[PDB]
């Protein structure tokens, strides 16, 4: 704030508060004469310096040098896509982090205003591009509420069934990639085969593995093909074991707990004030769920 004679953008002159008496020293003299008699030549003599560097108020112009500025930029595996995370590091400790976003800003909200409500739906598949069908559901519900229409009973169950299939797909991508970043590579491979089985359910009812424009305002695009429920159930009887085997490597691992316990703590008070929701909000002791 403001450029001062003791602090500017290029340097500063810091003076700590004195912790000793302001001693008064007058009449500096040597065995040959007074200080003023030899002060002209005293600049060559270090023993004649009248200022102590240990003094808290010793003037020192120190150049302002930025900390280690590391760009956790788009070409980094840790960033789940495009992110210019600018970190102010003192060694490896984080002092200040500046997440730069907009590298994936494609003006989706601007483009939607030029599309009809049916044409605008496929844009939502590409926002949270692992939980596609939930993205369609929130936009579908908004339009249905505005339209003052209600989805029939079977339609609601389908969006509930694929709403949780979508949630399993998202958590498979979220948790395993989180474990992969920490260093657990194997659970990532185990669960991504379960994604293949679940994405086959996406393709069977819509014809698209990922961007399935299936949930639409007023219901779903098409009815379930015959045999889907049997295939979903057969996968369900086995998916329980896949979760247990995933927990075999993470839940009780001492290495995994040393990387997660006490890391990124968020208080319940601050979680609400920062608009955190879901697992972020429920991790701090607040039992709130939109469902």
């Amino acid at each position: 704030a403001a450029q001062t004679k003791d602090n500017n953008d290029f340097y500063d002159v810091k003076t700590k508060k004195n912790d000793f008496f302001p001693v008064q020293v007058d009449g500096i003299e040597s065995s040959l004469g007074k200080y003023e008699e030899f002060a002209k030549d005293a600049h060559e003599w270090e023993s004649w310096n009248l200022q102590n560097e240990d003094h808290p108020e010793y003037p020192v112009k120190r150049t302002k040098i930025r900390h280690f500025t590391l760009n956790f930029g788009p070409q980094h595996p840790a960033a789940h896509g495009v992110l210019r995370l600018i970190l102010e590091l003192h060694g490896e400790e984080i002092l200040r982090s500046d997440p730069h976003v907009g590298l994936l800003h494609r003006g989706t909200e601007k483009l939607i205003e030029s599309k009809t409500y049916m044409q605008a739906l496929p844009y939502f598949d590409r926002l949270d591009y692992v939980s596609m069908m939930t993205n369609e559901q929130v936009f579908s519900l908004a339009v249905e509420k505005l339209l003052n229409l209600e989805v029939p009973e079977r339609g609601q169950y389908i969006r509930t069934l694929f709403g949780e299939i979508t949630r399993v797909l998202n958590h498979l991508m979220s948790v395993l990639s989180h474990a992969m970043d920490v260093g657990a590579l194997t659970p990532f491979l185990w669960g991504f085969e379960e994604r293949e089985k679940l994405m086959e359910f996406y393709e069977r009812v819509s014809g698209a593995r990922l961007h399935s424009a299936y949930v639409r305002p007023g219901g779903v695009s098409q009815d379930l093909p015959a045999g889907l429920l049997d295939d979903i159930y057969m996968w369900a009887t086995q998916f329980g074991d896949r979760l247990d085997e995933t927990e075999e490597l993470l839940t009780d691992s001492r290495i995994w707990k040393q990387r997660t316990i006490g890391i990124g703590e968020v208080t319940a008070e601050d979680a609400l004030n920062y608009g955190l929701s879901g697992v972020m909000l429920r991790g701090s002791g607040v039992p709130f769920d939109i469902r």
Binding site: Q3, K5, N8, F10, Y11, P59, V60, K61
Partner: protein, 95 residues
């Protein structure tokens, strides 16, 4: 080591040389030479001179001083009072 080695005459001499690199009205510059009247400097021309004087003496005028300075002598007084040598590395001093 870390102490000012400036003099009023040397600071004034280099202040005049910097100000003569601009399109000032008069080349006769002393302590009492005013920027606005004698040198004919407007808002932006004056700030260009102040920053140019900052580069010469490696000093930074504060906001209050720069927004109220009138004469060259005030610039000379500010440089004498506030100039410090930049701190060197550990190797420059003790070696």
């Amino acid at each position: 080591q870390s102490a000012s080695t400036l003099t009023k005459e040397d600071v004034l001499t280099r202040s005049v040389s910097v100000l003569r690199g601009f399109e000032v009205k008069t080349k006769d510059i002393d302590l009492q030479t005013t920027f606005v009247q004698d040198l004919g400097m407007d808002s932006l021309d004056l700030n260009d001179a102040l920053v140019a004087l900052e580069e010469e003496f490696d000093v930074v005028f504060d906001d209050k001083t720069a927004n109220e300075i009138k004469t060259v002598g005030e610039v000379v007084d500010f440089v004498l009072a506030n100039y410090l040598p930049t701190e060197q590395s550990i190797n420059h001093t003790i070696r």
